[PDB]
Design an enzyme around this catalytic site. Structure first.
Site, short mmCIF file in Angstrom:
data_model
loop_
_atom_site.label_atom_id
_atom_site.label_comp_id
_atom_site.label_asym_id
_atom_site.label_seq_id
_atom_site.Cartn_x
_atom_site.Cartn_y
_atom_site.Cartn_z
N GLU A 131 -29.56 43.03 43.50
CA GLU A 131 -28.72 44.38 43.82
C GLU A 131 -29.55 45.13 45.00
O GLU A 131 -29.39 46.46 44.67
CB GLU A 131 -28.52 45.34 42.52
CG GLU A 131 -27.67 44.57 41.61
CD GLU A 131 -26.19 44.19 42.01
OE1 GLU A 131 -25.46 44.83 42.55
OE2 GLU A 131 -25.79 42.99 41.64
N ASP A 132 -30.02 44.63 45.76
CA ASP A 132 -30.61 45.11 46.87
C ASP A 132 -32.00 46.08 46.53
O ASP A 132 -32.44 46.79 47.68
CB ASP A 132 -29.73 46.37 47.43
CG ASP A 132 -28.42 45.94 48.19
OD1 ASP A 132 -28.75 44.77 48.88
OD2 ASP A 132 -27.42 46.44 47.64
N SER A 133 -32.58 45.89 45.27
CA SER A 133 -34.09 46.10 45.37
C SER A 133 -34.93 45.25 46.31
O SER A 133 -34.35 44.51 46.80
CB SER A 133 -34.71 46.39 44.06
OG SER A 133 -34.20 45.79 42.85
N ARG A 169 -22.47 40.19 53.24
CA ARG A 169 -22.76 41.29 54.40
C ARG A 169 -22.46 40.67 55.64
O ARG A 169 -22.33 41.74 56.74
CB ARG A 169 -24.00 42.01 54.21
CG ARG A 169 -25.00 42.03 53.04
CD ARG A 169 -24.32 43.38 52.24
NE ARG A 169 -25.18 43.73 51.17
CZ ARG A 169 -25.08 44.26 50.07
NH1 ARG A 169 -23.71 44.61 49.74
NH2 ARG A 169 -26.16 44.23 49.29
N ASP A 203 -25.76 50.12 42.37
CA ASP A 203 -26.97 49.21 42.85
C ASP A 203 -28.06 49.88 43.29
O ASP A 203 -27.89 51.16 43.30
CB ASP A 203 -26.11 48.27 43.86
CG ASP A 203 -26.04 48.70 45.37
OD1 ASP A 203 -25.80 49.94 45.24
OD2 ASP A 203 -26.23 47.85 46.22
#
Ligand SMILES: [Zn+2]
Ligand SMILES: [Zn+2]
Ligand SMILES: [Zn+2]
Lengths: 408, 168, 550, 265, 155, 8, 84, 65, 59, 49, 113, 116
Positions: A127-129, A289, C136
């Protein structure tokens, strides 16, 4: 008027990898564009390959470059402005634009080139870490200076600067001020310490504490006067900021992420040359994206490093993934960016190969509301948690006990 | 034919076929009466309302009408014997489990179903619903769609954007 | 206040119902615990560590009601607790706390978690709570609230606890499932092709914490002891779980492997993916909840995660530029597919310019012209994206994400590899904003695809300047609409809540409002809780009569 | 000496390029990890800034000082400051160095690691000397000074390991590879047309037999031959990085034996 | 349109039918034209449906509309939730607006609302969270929809 | 950004 | 406004809200040194104790359920079935 | 500001290479790829360190004080 | 601006004046703070525009 | 109103960007008037992203 | 809020290097908590345990990357103490590294610099 | 106690599906005209050509211990050996096994041994 896009459109096989163009031509042209890449403003001039990005992601980048840290000016050391952020070690981006020349970017850059792996590796980058190299952090990666400066005057009868001593002061000690009322460069402050010592006539206390969540060393202290009268004062405070779990970072393509966890080099995965990522982002942040440009920058920048050239990432040129891929292959690397990698814990190969290369990353600002309003009230009602609702929404107003008539 | 209903009979049955190691290659020891009476009796026990009058008793009969359709179709005699092959033991356990799962499915007095409802419709409407229409226009052309439409609805707007009759 | 805010990050290693609480925040938030024989020792101990050590305590309130501050008291290290005293102690491992993200639009957005105190300074969530929170870890922040009484603790843990929210009444199905990395890995782990060596197996076995120490016999004993991906995942599934699904052309021998059969919590066949382990239907998470209870279910999330993540760590997974390239072949075909639609659009222009196009009923010529052009262009895009997706091969990383169901879609792949396609503002093609032209690079009265914003190129090949601009035009239209809800919807939801807020189910099964007016004579017209309701087939209803009689 | 075989192909003052063989993958790896992570080394661990008048911040400079590799040849003879019975630092567990620079020219003045000066007593252990490797004997550029600018400072070098901070790592990179031909099928090559064509063969394909196509997959074969190359950052001679790599690992495992021993007693 | 309809032998079978879709509404007058099936006529203006067919029809149409908005973007919401909304908007016999606009009790708290409370002789049933907070009590929702007290017959 | 009756 | 033990039409099942409030009410008392009613076979946490008591049907509390029209039914915790 | 001491990704001493790299460019009149190989910066992690370094110290030094 | 001192200063002059050679001007200094005037977009004057008006209007 | 702002100084190009910024004031009935949209005629004059 | 970085390798207080617990769900098994160690010892010691034939189980795991500790589980055939297997796996390792150091040192002296 | 089954096939199709290590085999009896065998095999560990007859045995706990040897053997004398669960003893008109997802049918829960 009628405008030609390329000067080449004013004259009289097809390479499969090129994008398709449509002319006619034309014979009636009155003007011709200087260069199409010139429709972009300043922010977007910085994105490599914006013509391979999804429209809105360009827009996100345009707001994000505005939160990157770099070197806002070269005289930074002599200005006492409210806040400032400087990278320790700015690098020019391996993938640049022709428009960057005039924007002074190579000269006053706002990021560094991370060796980034695109991998599922242990799951701490979902999740984008991001997984960042603790060892690159040790060695200077993304470390930045941060300056805040506090101000204060006297008067408007009188106020004076001085170290006061209980004759209603503030909690944090006044210990660090000299007798003129000011700490002095070099002193290490933290917590709530009195930075500026101010009094109002015995004495009501009007001094300036240091911002609660901070610390550092005092950098410059300036004493001066306004055009009439006021002796005033400005204290700049320096802090270094080491990349750390929860800090924000973004490529130039409008996806930020924070550091989920940091690994030391040993624990990282590695190429056979013993090269190791500074940074691991997730594959899953990719398909949707529509962020192809990011992949190309990476492809492009790896060739740049290998060959010692600036990689041209300007929009609307004839540069191609095949172009770049063929250049990379010559350097003896797998044409499409992939590399065989081994698992740090174990040394065993990975069953997958990893997209692996440099990419330019920006450190963004901010670390360093809480509320129970209507909508939280509704969730708790939906749960039918009425005791919690009573307890949260009430008060120390405590039970006053009254008597009431049963008839009226 | 697929509609949200309580108690997943299919699963209760595959459980029973597993728990009792159901030998598909033998006669069952279930009688016809076991099944038919068994199933009739179980319906008498799927309680949603409990009042002992003609009105609540009807309301109760109405409440479990659709479920009982499902039930009678799953526990048709032939279907039980030829398809499921349940034994008297397995079958008896299917029944009482349906009863238990059923009573376990009843809404609990004190549920704030209102906020529940609002939140259940609101969250998707802002989840979203992204757009807006598309829009449209001209060609094919138009029919307004949530959110502007959701807003027309909740507003009870007399001046609706794209009114339309469908005539069969 | 009794609350705290900070950035959040995911943690492969927390249980579903846990929250990592930074130690530093944990020192700042207290719970008042009355002193009893059951805790005097613990509390005594805590008081001794004081405000600066964790687990500590910040105050001791005696009978009289006076609060001894352990930060400053003379007697910080010399206190002897009485029964009846209260000790404002730090939050600790397993305290129920309420955790929430804004805006909170429905209730699985405040849920109760069990604390796990940890270093560093972010809150940490299990990957599968991400969806109910709509969170998120790209800068999002969350609020943690500490209940302040024995009754409010109970309320949180018996009504809001995460596991009790797995199956939600919103859509009568799970609202949490295996996601992201674990979904990617779970597919791959479970292909027939996946085999594991003894050495690796022992690790994986050991990783599922509720494991009984019994090494499943290898699917292959000779020529070498070897274990299925299916075999080991299976260890994570609890005994007594049965599941049965049939996708397109699934047979009892599923040639494609394909479908799903679980018996006694052992995977008989089918690649585990989003329809088996996502928040599906369904669906192993639905099933385990209902057969085994919320706690056992909530633990499944972490067992599968632990096992899959570990397998993934050593298999590895990536995606790169090469996953967006089509061998073309496919390229030649896509280019030709578009050249085809530019020819149907040209042939309709010539037609309509001769005045041969007939209007339909209740449409202009120009309207019905536009309609044809937009359908040709759309079906060209469509079939160009299809051409690309067939060429993607099983080892293709994007195609693997897709198959697993973990992000993204056909459209994504298609814009990247085939063709961005038609930009549009206000539902029409790009308008003549200049007099009879969309840009000054064109001649006037040019309704060709190029002119009106068909983007022919993929993101891979990059856009021409014209396509770039038109794609920005389309771009902005979407941004503006996002900016119009935020907040046009946070406003609808507030209105919906207000109208319904007082409706409640009463002990006679009716739903009523606060005046006590009947709204439904029985809730939902069936008296049921939507969280215990699921799609089932009414057989009785389909098929011929012959079929029904038989 | 039956056991892990070592060959060697290059060797120099900075790199040793060797083949490990007759070992399980784990051991090749743990030795790989150690060399990166756990070999004791000397490095500046504390700066005291008397005057800084440069254009850099004190901690900016302090950071750089800790990154200057120091001679660490005799480091086992130096104690861990945390174990030393001295109050803070002493000659038993630390080296003290000085930096004084003044810019006394119109021209711009450079400050290098050669300008550091040991001021503590070295007891004749070979330790503390800043490592110099460039043609003109300058070592690292620490700072740059304009005319009139000044830098006076005291650093204490202390023993540490990479785990604690990467300035202590003796090793630059470690190239590591096995099964260059993919006999074992530990990897699975991504391709468009042909993996054979698109993937370049590594160096080490020369040193091993390519498999013959008419062949069953060899299912018993294991990772037992490893192509390594260790690069020393200077603070220890390379040969040592490997040697002491092996040693620290020994000390580590042995230390587990002393704990089992100690839970009988 | 395709129409799923049972066949003479029983299975559903697609029977396609011609349908007319209009721009603008006059339900009462169209409903009446020969050749149509007036039992199936529909419109998306639930207001016109309630005025020609009545609230119960008004209600069902209002459901079909709220339903379509949600379904339009692929999403699914259990029946009872929209059923509940639609019953609230319909329960006083007409179509009550929701969003519009629109105890005690207590944010502004416009003294003017208490004045009307006074002159109206308004009786607060005290079921809201808010009037229960002002009064320092547990609200009669969920966990507090009942009292608890000591048993005095358990051994 | 996709086509008419899809995305802008 | 009180309805006899033999004409109760409300559910014989304890609701999830009843259980929460009962468990929370007993917990509080246990948490304040109020005498306990079972063998704590190791238990020291008031809510866990409270649950042991419920399980073993030894919580002397009664639930007064209000009907919308003001009347009410009384059910002992001892009486109510605990299946959720 | 100035040459980093070590390469971020592997730790090679790199802070001793900057003057020579300038010299290789101007007086030997070489290109940057060859320059960096002549300095033994094979790994592209190390190449990046010198190739993209921006020596702002040279501007800061122009301030009066 | 022509009027400001820095308008005709050599690079070397700028360093002495403690102004970054890279600073581009275009802003004011008011009470110590640096202020920009954001371009305000407006419709042009002296321009004939015709517009329709929706159906409830008498024009 | 809003016409004079404190100059950005986060990064260099943030400064440049700020000095090249335009704003459209709105209202008194904004309609009718699609000011938010990227008009064709912005080509070359005003950045599209 | 970060711990001191010396906590990855430095013990205590209150902490010892090894905790041995006698498992539960299996005869003759053991679970050892190693403190201030990571994958370097973990994978090593385990891999060697797995060359023992009298070992029917060996496996390790780092439960969370934040803390430096691993759990290691050894089950063995009856009459064989797991603590002795660990011993033997260790000794077996101590040797093989000795062997290797010496071999390397040998090959080193052959070299022309 | 005991050998459940014993015959000879006679492969008739080597399908690799979309796999690399696994193949789905179609065989037939070398005795009974009727009686088929579909079976999934690790074609990496036991390659199988097409025609290509092999003798197939089905045969017959509690944990797992590596070999060992000498030593004993429930039945050494084979090349390929698998283990799996019987999952559908079924319809017809005149048995299914899972091997952790390699499927077999013969036109609880035991061993499969093969030679060649
Ligand atoms: Zn009275
Ligand atoms: Zn000492
Ligand atoms: Zn490097």
């Amino acid at each position: 008027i009628l405008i030609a896009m390329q000067p080449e459109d004013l004259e009289p096989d097809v390479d499969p990898a090129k994008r398709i163009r449509v002319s006619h031509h034309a014979t009636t042209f009155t003007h011709c564009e200087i260069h199409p890449s010139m429709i972009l403003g300043v922010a977007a001039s910085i994105i490599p390959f914006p013509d391979h990005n999804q429209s809105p992601r360009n827009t996100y980048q345009s707001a994000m470059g505005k939160q990157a840290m770099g070197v806002f000016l070269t005289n930074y050391n002599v200005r006492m402005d409210t806040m400032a952020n400087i990278l320790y070690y700015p690098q020019k981006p391996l993938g640049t634009t022709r428009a960057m020349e005039y924007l002074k970017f190579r000269e006053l850059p706002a990021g560094q080139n991370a060796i980034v792996a695109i991998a599922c590796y242990s799951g701490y980058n979902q999740e984008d870490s991001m997984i960042m190299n603790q060892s690159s952090i040790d060695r200077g990666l993304f470390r930045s200076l941060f300056f805040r400066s506090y101000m204060d005057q006297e008067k408007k009868i009188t106020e004076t600067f001085e170290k006061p001593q209980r004759t209603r002061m503030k909690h944090g000690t006044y210990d660090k001020l000299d007798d003129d009322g000011l700490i002095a460069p070099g002193v290490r402050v933290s917590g709530e310490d009195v930075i500026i010592g101010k009094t109002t006539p015995s004495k009501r206390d009007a001094s300036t504490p240091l911002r609660s969540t901070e610390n550092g060393i005092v950098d410059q202290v300036l004493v001066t006067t306004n055009q009439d009268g006021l002796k005033f004062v400005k204290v700049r405070v320096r802090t270094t900021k080491i990349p750390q779990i929860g800090d924000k970072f973004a490529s130039r393509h409008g996806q930020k992420g924070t550091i989920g966890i940091t690994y030391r080099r040993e624990d990282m995965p590695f190429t056979a040359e013993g090269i190791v990522p500074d940074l691991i982002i997730n594959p899953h942040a990719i398909p949707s994206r529509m962020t192809v440009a990011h992949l190309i920058e990476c492809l492009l920048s790896k060739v740049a490093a290998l060959s010692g050239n600036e990689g041209d990432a300007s929009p609307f040129t004839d540069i191609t993934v095949e172009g770049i891929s063929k250049l990379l292959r010559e350097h003896g690397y797998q044409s499409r960016g992939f590399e065989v990698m081994y698992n740090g814990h174990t040394g065993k190969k990975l069953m997958a190969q990893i997209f692996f290369g440099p990419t330019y990353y920006q450190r963004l600002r901010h670390m360093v509301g809480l509320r129970f309003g209507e909508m939280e009230r509704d969730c708790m009602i939906a749960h039918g948690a009425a005791s919690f609702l009573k307890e949260r929404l009430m008060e120390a107003s405590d039970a006053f006990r009254v008597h009431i008539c049963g008839i009226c | 034919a697929n509609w949200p209903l309580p108690v997943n009979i299919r699963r209760i049955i595959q459980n029973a076929q597993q728990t009792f190691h159901i030998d598909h290659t033998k006669p069952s020891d279930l009688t016809i009466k076991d099944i038919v009476l068994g199933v009739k009796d179980l319906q008498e026990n799927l309680l949603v309302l409990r009042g002992k009058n003609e009105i609540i008793q009807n309301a109760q009969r109405d409440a479990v009408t659709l479920f009982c359709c499902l039930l009678r179709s799953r526990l048709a005699t032939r279907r039980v014997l030829q398809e499921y092959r349940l034994t008297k033991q397995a079958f008896d356990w299917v029944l009482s489990n349906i009863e238990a799962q059923f009573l376990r499915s009843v809404v609990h007095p004190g549920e704030m179903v209102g906020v529940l409802a609002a939140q259940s419709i609101g969250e998707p409407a802002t989840q979203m619903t992204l757009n807006t229409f598309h829009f449209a226009g001209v060609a094919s052309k138009k029919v307004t769609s949530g959110v502007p439409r959701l807003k027309e609805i909740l507003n009870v707007a007399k001046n609706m954007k794209t009114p339309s009759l469908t005539v069969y | 206040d009794f609350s705290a805010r900070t950035v959040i990050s995911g943690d492969p290693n927390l249980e579903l119902d846990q929250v990592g609480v930074p130690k530093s925040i944990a020192k700042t938030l207290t719970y008042p615990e009355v002193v009893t024989p059951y805790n005097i020792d613990r509390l005594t101990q805590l008081v001794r560590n004081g405000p600066n050590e964790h687990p500590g305590a910040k105050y001791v309130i005696r009978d009289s009601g006076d609060r001894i501050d352990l930060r400053y008291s003379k007697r910080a290290g010399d206190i002897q607790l009485q029964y009846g005293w209260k000790v404002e102690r730090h939050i600790m491992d397993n305290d129920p706390v309420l955790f929430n993200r804004q805006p909170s639009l429905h209730k699985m957005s405040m849920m109760a978690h069990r604390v796990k105190v940890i270093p560093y300074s972010t809150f940490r969530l299990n990957l599968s709570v991400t969806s109910p929170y709509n969170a998120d870890f790209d800068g999002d922040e969350m609020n943690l609230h500490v209940p302040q009484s024995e009754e409010t603790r109970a309320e949180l843990s018996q009504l809001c606890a995460v596991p009790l929210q797995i199956v939600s009444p919103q859509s009568n199905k799970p609202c949490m499932g295996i996601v992201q990395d674990t979904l990617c890995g779970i597919r791959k782990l479970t292909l027939r092709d996946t085999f594991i060596e003894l050495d690796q197996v022992l690790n994986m076995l050991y990783w599922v914490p509720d494991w009984d120490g019994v090494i499943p016999t290898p699917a292959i004993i000779k020529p070498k002891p070897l274990w299925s991906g299916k075999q080991i995942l299976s260890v994570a599934i609890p005994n007594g779980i049965h599941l049965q699904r049939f996708d397109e052309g699934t047979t009892l021998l599923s040639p494609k492997d394909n479908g799903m059969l679980i018996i006694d919590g052992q995977i008989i066949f089918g690649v585990v993916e989003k329809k088996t382990v996502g928040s599906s239907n369904g669906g192993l998470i639905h099933v385990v909840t209902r057969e085994k209870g919320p706690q056992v279910c909530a633990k499944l999330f972490g067992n599968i995660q632990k096992v899959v993540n570990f397998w993934l760590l050593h298999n590895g997974f990536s995606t790169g530029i090469g996953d967006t390239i089509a061998d073309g072949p496919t390229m030649r075909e896509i280019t030709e597919t578009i050249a085809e639609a530019k020819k149907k659009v040209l042939d309709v222009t010539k037609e309509a310019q001769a005045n041969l196009l007939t209007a339909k009923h209740g449409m202009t010529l120009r309207e019905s012209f536009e309609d044809n052009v937009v359908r040709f262009l759309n079906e060209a895009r469509d079939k160009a994206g299809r051409l690309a997706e067939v060429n993607l091969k099983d080892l293709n990383n994007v195609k693997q994400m897709v198959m697993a169901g973990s992000k993204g879609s056909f459209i994504n792949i298609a814009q990247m590899s085939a063709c961005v396609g038609q930009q549009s503002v206000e539902g029409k093609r790009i308008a003549f904003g200049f007099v009879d032209r969309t840009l000054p690079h064109f001649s006037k009265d040019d309704y060709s695809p190029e002119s009106k914003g068909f983007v022919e190129n993929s993101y891979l090949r990059g856009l021409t300047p014209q396509e770039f601009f038109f794609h920005a035009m389309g771009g902005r239209e979407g941004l503006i609409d996002t900016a119009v809800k935020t907040a046009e919807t946070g406003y609808i939801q507030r209105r919906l809540v207000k109208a319904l807020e007082d409706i409640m189910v009463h002990y006679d099964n009716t739903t009523r409002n606060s005046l006590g007016n009947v709204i439904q004579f029985i809730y939902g017209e069936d008296g049921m809780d939507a969280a215990h309701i699921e799609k089932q087939s009414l057989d009785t209803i389909g098929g011929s009569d012959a079929a029904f009689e038989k | 000496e039956e056991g892990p075989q070592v060959k060697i192909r290059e060797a120099s003052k900075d790199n040793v390029d060797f083949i490990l063989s007759n070992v399980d993958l784990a051991m090749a790896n743990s030795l790989r990890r150690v060399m990166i992570a756990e070999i004791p080394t000397l490095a500046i661990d504390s700066v005291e800034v008397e005057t800084n008048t440069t254009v850099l911040a004190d901690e900016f400079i302090a950071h750089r000082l800790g990154l200057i590799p120091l001679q660490s040849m005799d480091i086992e003879q130096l104690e861990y400051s945390r174990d030393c019975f001295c109050e803070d630092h002493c000659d038993k567990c630390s080296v003290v160095l000085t930096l004084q620079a003044f810019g006394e020219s119109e021209s711009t003045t450079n400050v290098y690691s050669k300008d550091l000066v040991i001021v503590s007593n070295l007891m004749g252990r070979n330790i503390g000397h800043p490592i110099i490797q460039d043609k003109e004997g300058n070592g690292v550029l620490i700072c740059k000074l304009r005319k009139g600018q000044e830098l006076k400072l005291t650093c204490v070098a202390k023993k540490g390991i990479a785990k604690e901070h990467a300035k202590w790592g003796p090793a630059a990179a470690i190239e590591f590879e096995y099964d260059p031909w993919n006999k074992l099928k530990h990897t699975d090559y991504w391709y468009e047309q042909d993996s054979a064509k698109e993937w370049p063969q590594s160096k080490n394909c020369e040193y091993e037999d390519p498999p013959n196509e008419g062949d069953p997959f060899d299912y018993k074969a294991q990772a037992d031959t490893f192509y390594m190359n260790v690069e020393s950052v200077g603070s220890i001679p390379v040969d040592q990085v490997v040697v002491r790599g092996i040693d620290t690992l020994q000390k580590k495992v042995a230390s587990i034996l002393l704990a089992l021993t100690q839970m009988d007693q | 349109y395709d129409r799923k309809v049972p066949s003479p032998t029983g299975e559903y079978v697609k029977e396609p039918e011609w349908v007319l879709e209009t721009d603008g509404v006059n339900l009462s007058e169209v409903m009446t034209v020969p050749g149509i099936d007036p039992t199936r006529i529909y419109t998306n203006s639930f207001i016109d449906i309630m005025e020609v067919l009545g609230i119960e029809a008004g209600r069902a149409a209002l459901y079909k509309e709220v339903y379509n908005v949600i379904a339009s973007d692929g999403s699914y919401v259990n029946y009872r939730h929209m059923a509940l909304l639609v019953d609230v908007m319909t329960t006083q016999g007409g179509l009550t607006s929701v969003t519009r606009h629109g105890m005690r009790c207590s944010f502004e708290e416009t003294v003017e609302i208490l004045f009307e409370a006074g002159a109206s002789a308004e009786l607060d049933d005290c079921r809201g969270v808010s009037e229960n907070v002002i009064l320092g009590q547990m609200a009669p929702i969920g966990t507090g929809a009942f009292d608890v007290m000591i048993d005095e017959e358990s051994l | 950004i996709w086509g008419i009756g899809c995305n802008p | 406004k009180a309805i006899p033990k033999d004409q109760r039409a409300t559910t014989p099942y304890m609701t999830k809200y009843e259980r929460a409030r009962i468990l929370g009410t007993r917990a509080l008392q246990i948490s304040m040194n109020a005498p306990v009613f079972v063998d704590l076979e190791g238990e020291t946490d008031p809510l866990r104790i409270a649950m042991k008591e419920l399980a073993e049907k030894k919580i002397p509390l009664v639930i007064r359920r209000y009907l919308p029209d003001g009347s009410f039914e009384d059910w002992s915790v001892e009486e109510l079935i605990v299946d959720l | 500001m100035i040459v980093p001491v070590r390469c971020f990704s592997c730790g090679k001493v790199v802070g001793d290479k900057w003057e020579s790299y300038l010299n290789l460019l101007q007086e030997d009149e070489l290109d940057e790829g060859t320059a960096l190989s002549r300095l033994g910066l094979k790994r592209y992690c190390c190449r990046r360190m010198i190739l993209t370094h921006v020596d702002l110290i040279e501007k800061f030094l122009r301030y009066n004080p | 601006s022509k009027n400001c001192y820095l308008s005709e200063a050599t690079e070397s002059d700028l360093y002495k004046l403690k102004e970054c050679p890279f600073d581009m001007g275009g802003y004011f200094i008011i009470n110590g703070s640096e202020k920009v005037l954001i371009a305000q977009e407006r419709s042009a004057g002296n321009i004939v525009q015709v517009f329709k008006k929706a159906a409830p209007s008498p024009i | 109103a809003g016409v004079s702002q404190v100059l950005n100084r986060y990064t260099y190009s943030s400064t440049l960007s700020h000095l090249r910024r335009t704003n459209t004031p709105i209202g008194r009935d904004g309609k009718l008037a699609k000011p938010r949209q990227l008009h064709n005629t912005h080509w070359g004059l005003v950045c599209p992203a | 809020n970060a711990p001191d970085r010396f906590e990855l390798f430095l013990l205590g207080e209150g902490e010892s290097k090894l905790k041995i617990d006698p498992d539960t769900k299996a005869p003759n098994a053991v679970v050892i908590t190693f403190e201030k160690e990571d994958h370097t010892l973990g994978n090593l010691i385990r891999a060697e345990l797995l060359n023992d034939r009298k070992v029917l189980f060996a496996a390790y795991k780092v439960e969370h990357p934040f803390f430096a500790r691993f759990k290691l589980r050894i089950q063995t055939t009856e009459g064989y103490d797991p603590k002795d297997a660990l011993k033997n796996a260790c000794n077996s390792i101590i040797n093989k590294l000795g062997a290797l150091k010496t071999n390397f040192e040998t090959e080193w002296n052959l070299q022309t610099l | 106690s005991n050998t459940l089954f014993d015959d000879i096939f006679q492969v008739s199709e080597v399908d690799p599906g979309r796999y690399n290590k696994v193949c789905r085999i179609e065989a037939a009896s070398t005795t009974q005209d009727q009686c088929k065998l579909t079976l999934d095999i690790n074609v990496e560990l036991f390659p199988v050509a097409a025609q290509d007859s092999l003798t197939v045995t089905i045969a017959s706990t509690r944990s797992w211990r590596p070999p060992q040897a000498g030593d004993r053997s429930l039945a050494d004398d084979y090349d390929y050996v698998m283990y799996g669960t019987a999952y559908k003893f079924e319809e017809v008109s005149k048995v299914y096994y899972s091997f952790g997802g390699l499927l077999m049918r013969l036109e609880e829960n035991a061993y499969l041994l093969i030679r060649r």
